[PDB]
Design a protein around this ligand. Structure first.
Ligand SMILES: OC[C@H]1O[C@H](O[C@H]2[C@H](O)C[C@@H](O)O[C@@H]2CO)[C@H](O)[C@@H](O)[C@@H]1O
Ligand SMILES: OC[C@H]1O[C@H](O[C@H]2[C@H](O)C[C@H](O)O[C@@H]2CO)[C@H](O)[C@@H](O)[C@@H]1O
Length: 490
């Protein structure tokens, strides 16, 4: 079989704020000259936040889709496809966030009087960037639950954008499930003083999560068990805590129990909302996708602290990503792994960082459960080094000259299209990165040629019970990676 079968598409995130808080598409002319450069480079499509807080600003079910319609139209004129994020989170407190976009005021307003709608840490600090899982099903938002708000929103988006959908502009709907749109707890909030190699904190202290946890321990036989109180603070290192030190609480019956409870809330949160998404886009030619954060720090210690606090119950003897993938399988969704570029040696030694190993684990787990895997770079990079790492992850075993590769990612969405990227030398490198993703082929407008035809979304398969999800915690050996890509940019 031909070469084109090796092709891996490349998408480019649009600038934050392209449609501003006031629901105004700010500078079409400018964007337009940018997009035209991307089309010339061979870029397949672009990715954009569809901010909940801009759209449903005025009041419940007061959507204004107008400015996004304009943007989508301009994208379509430029010959590019589009990845749309249902961004139900706030823009501002995370790395790179240059614009502030909060969640809806009417929701914020409720929170002034029910503070427990937000994620809360042990100290009682409310993080307003995303509604707590604790309220997925509480009918406190003027009669709706949070999951109903998201579901209504996606329905609305589907009806109002049906022409773009039916025209094949939109290729994938990325469903936002937490801060930065990722399925995770906001355990490393810059806005609270968290700093890089920092362990982060559990975020289950809001009233609803807490009561749920209390009732669950009581049913387990230990009504007396309580939420972790020996985990430390944002910037600790694990050895310095009772929870994460060796032989600490995390390996006790109660730590295990808490941990399982805490990581299960996410799996469940993701599964219920994807259920709604599936129903909203049923029949549309689009794939659904979720975003999983790459938390590589502490990966190389037995306690995987940062992962744990973010809600990924991953250890050396318990695969805590594979279960997410198996959950995605019923929805036929793509796991978008948000960190792909980093090399272990680029990390401060004191972080016990295992970015490359984390990647192999996560993509292997995906491929093993037979779902599609995509990903992004976590930080801005312009060098061949970044690029050649993303290319290797894309096709871990190199190109197949006589057939499709045995392993390949479904797509990669590069981190942001800025002036910097478009500067002459930077851009020249980019163009090569694009070319090698495409396996040296020219940009290929019909994805069916490279075995990416899109079909109408089917209904999810049936609910997989938690037990079964949790079987996927059995560790497996990763697939073998080459050491260097066979398609270097350099
Ligand atoms: O949730 C946002 C991102 O968080 C992590 O990115 C970190 C970098 O890996 C290292 C350092 O600069 O801090 C960043 C977080 O503030 C994660 O790696 C990404 O996948 C997430 O998108
Ligand atoms: O515009 C998409 C997403 O970008 C930022 O979050 C990114 C992160 O900076 C890079 C990493 O590869 O993935 C995260 C999610 O894509 C913004 O913070 C986030 O709010 C925005 O939705």
């Amino acid at each position: 079989s031909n070469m084109l079968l090796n092709y891996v598409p490349v998408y480019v995130m649009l600038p934050l704020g392209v449609v501003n808080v006031d629901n105004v598409f700010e500078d079409p002319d400018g964007l337009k000259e940018q997009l035209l450069q991307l089309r010339a480079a061979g870029v397949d499509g672009v990715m954009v936040d569809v901010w909940w807080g801009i759209i449903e600003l005025k009041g419940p079910k007061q959507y204004d889709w107008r400015a996004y319609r304009s943007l989508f139209q301009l994208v379509q004129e430029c010959g590019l496809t589009l990845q749309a994020i249902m961004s139900f989170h706030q823009c501002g407190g995370n790395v790179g966030d240059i614009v502030n976009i909060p969640i809806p005021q009417w929701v914020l307003d409720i929170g002034e009087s029910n503070h427990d709608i937000f994620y809360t840490n042990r100290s009682g600090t409310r993080n307003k960037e995303y509604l707590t899982v604790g309220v997925d099903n509480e009918p406190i938002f003027h009669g709706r639950t949070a999951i109903e708000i998201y579901s209504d929103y996606m329905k609305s988006f589907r009806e109002n954008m049906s022409d773009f959908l039916e025209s094949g502009l939109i290729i994938d709907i990325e469903v936002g499930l937490g801060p930065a749109g990722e399925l995770r707890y906001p355990s490393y909030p810059q806005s609270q003083g968290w700093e890089f190699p920092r362990i982060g904190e559990f975020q289950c202290y809001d009233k609803y999560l807490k009561a749920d946890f209390k009732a669950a321990v009581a049913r387990a036989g230990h009504p007396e068990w309580e939420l972790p109180d020996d985990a430390g603070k944002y910037n600790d290192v694990p050895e310095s805590t009772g929870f994460f030190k060796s032989n600490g609480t995390y390996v006790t019956e109660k730590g295990k129990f808490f941990l399982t409870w805490y990581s299960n809330k996410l799996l469940n949160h993701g599964d219920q909302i994807l259920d709604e998404a599936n129903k909203a886009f049923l029949g549309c030619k689009v794939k659904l996708a979720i975003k999983v954060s790459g938390i590589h720090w502490w990966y190389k210690v037995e306690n995987h602290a940062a992962e744990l606090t973010a809600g990924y119950y991953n250890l050396n003897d318990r695969d805590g990503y594979r279960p997410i993938a198996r959950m995605l399988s019923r929805h036929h969704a793509i796991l978008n792994f948000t960190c792909l570029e980093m090399r272990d040696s680029e990390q401060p030694s004191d972080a016990k960082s295992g970015p490359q190993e984390l990647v192999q684990q996560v993509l292997s787990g995906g491929w093993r459960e037979d779902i599609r895997v995509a990903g992004e770079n976590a930080l801005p990079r312009y060098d061949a080094t970044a690029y050649n790492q993303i290319i290797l992850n894309a096709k871990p075993q190199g190109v197949n000259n006589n057939g499709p590769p045995k392993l390949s990612m479904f797509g990669v969405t590069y981190l942001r299209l800025s002036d910097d990227l478009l500067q002459k030398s930077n851009f020249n490198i980019f163009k090569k990165f694009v070319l090698k993703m495409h396996a040296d082929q020219d940009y290929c407008a019909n994805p069916q040629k490279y075995n990416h035809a899109i079909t109408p979304l089917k209904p999810s398969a049936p609910k997989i019970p938690i037990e079964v999800l949790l079987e996927a915690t059995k560790p497996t050996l990763p697939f073998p990676w080459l050491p260097e890509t066979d398609m270097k940019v350099d």
